[PDB]
Assembly symmetry: none
Homo-oligomer: 301 residues x 2
């Protein structure tokens, strides 16, 4: 994974490679040595080396049909709505794990949450888990209308869909924490819930513990909260999603992160959005494209 | 030659009067009565008898001996589609050493075809196969292990054996698709049993990552490079390569054979030869049953 982990590679060129738009290995693997040597200012011989080393690094494993079928019955995921995105996520949002989508405002984190709170209700055959979703609204982002249109586009009972989503406003950090604490009860008292969504987790934490003077305690507290969510997910076999708003994490000191899977979302040509894996145990790196339509999260074009 | 536009000594004004009359295909004109064509299209009777002679020759009807054909059948092995009709259109079935494309609207039956072929390949020459394995590169998550199963049962095969004879892989985008094909050479070498490679929805990612007419150029350049790659493997390791595309003074096409698929009344589907060296123009009809690809009736 990652370019930083390439064998026999100086740490000076690794910069001239990210400073040239080559962030992922798949990008290097299929790139031309001649074109990489110019766009990055690297010795032609060094180019054919970084690409030879990048080409091996690719985890191309051809699994049998049979084996993959065993893997499908051994796991169940909630489909995002965009075939592209689903593939990046090896199938969809997995239960038992916490998934984070972080990105600038309008990168599509909010759309995605609503989309998942509905798709989750669909039967396995149609991409869901015939389950309920709990939507913890941190900064008043829930839109009953988005739920509606997404609902229609699937020809579902608007009213039924909405009734399958538990809603709650967490006004502050303490409340957020206590709400997720109470989450255990509700999930025990109603085993149908299979998706918890916490939109803008970090938010109150950033407001109640601002700046670099608190960062220590903020994360100390933030992380504790997320450990919590994780455990819940793992223990009651339910999918947990968190969205975190940022403005640009170095790309276009190594910090610590709790979240199992971490996908970054970027804005593109108006209607389009790019999704890229940044942290994930079994997911392979590489970004893909999708879009925001009225039907909800779909693939582009 | 295919398409009416390729007819020799034919004006371009009538070519419109013919298509405006309903004569779009050549076999339809070949079997047409010059009198009725003359009226239906408002074309000189002399000119009607001419276009139908041209069209009927365009068909390329060769009468080989029974002996000569038998020789030609041992000189080549093909994977059968399941539908006698289609096989017939394909001169016997899917040929190795060649890339075949099936394109058409969604549900036109390109997906079912790919699954059908990934199973028929494992069959022994006597039963239509080549006793080989298949590699299914899934572009948009279309693989259904369920379809492979029923297709499997209907043949009285070992579901779990068949499935174990199909390598699967998910190509989440262009770069991955490309890379997966680059490594394809190793795998075929590493395992000479593999005789079928199927790439469902090739064009797909390319149309996503390089959208519109603004990229078309780079799309085809990359697309052709990709495909030039697939061909070589087919040719070099003596194996069939199938690709499906989803559609609804240059134009740069690589694919050897290009069969178009169309949706008909419910269960029925039509397949028409669009591009092909040795294959004769003409469409045929088949059907998507639960057993898999079969003939309609």
């Amino acid at each position: 994974k990652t370019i930083n982990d390439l064998p026999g590679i100086s740490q000076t060129v690794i910069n001239k490679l990210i400073e040239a738009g080559y962030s992922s290995l798949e990008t290097l693997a299929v790139a031309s040595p001649q074109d990489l040597s110019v766009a990055a200012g690297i010795p032609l011989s060094t180019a054919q080396k970084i690409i030879k080393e990048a080409r091996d690094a690719l985890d191309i494993r051809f699994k049998t049909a049979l084996e993959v079928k065993k893997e499908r019955m051994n796991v169940k995921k909630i489909s995002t709505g965009s075939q592209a995105l689903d593939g990046l996520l090896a199938g969809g949002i997995e239960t038992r794990t916490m998934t984070e989508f972080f990105g600038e405002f309008g990168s599509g984190k909010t759309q995605l949450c609503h989309q998942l709170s509905v798709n989750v209700q669909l039967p396995p055959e149609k991409g869901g888990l015939s389950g309920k979703a709990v939507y913890i609204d941190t900064e008043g982002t829930f839109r009953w209308e988005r739920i509606e249109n997404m609902a229609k586009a699937l020809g579902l009972d608007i009213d039924n869909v909405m009734n399958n989503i538990y809603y709650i406003r967490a006004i502050n950090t303490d409340h957020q924490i206590a709400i997720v604490d109470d989450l255990q009860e509700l999930v025990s008292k109603d085993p149908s819930i299979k998706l918890i969504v916490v939109d803008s987790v970090t938010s109150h934490f950033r407001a109640e513990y601002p700046g670099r003077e608190n960062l220590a305690v903020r994360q100390q507290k933030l992380n504790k909260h997320l450990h919590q969510l994780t455990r819940l997910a793992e223990v009651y076999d339910i999918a947990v999603i968190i969205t975190n708003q940022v403005m640009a994490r170095p790309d276009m000191h190594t910090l610590y992160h709790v979240p199992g899977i971490r996908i970054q979302l970027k804005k593109s040509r108006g209607n389009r959005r790019i999704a890229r894996v940044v942290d994930a145990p079994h997911l392979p790196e590489g970004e893909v494209v999708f879009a925001l339509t009225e039907e909800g999260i779909r693939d582009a074009e």
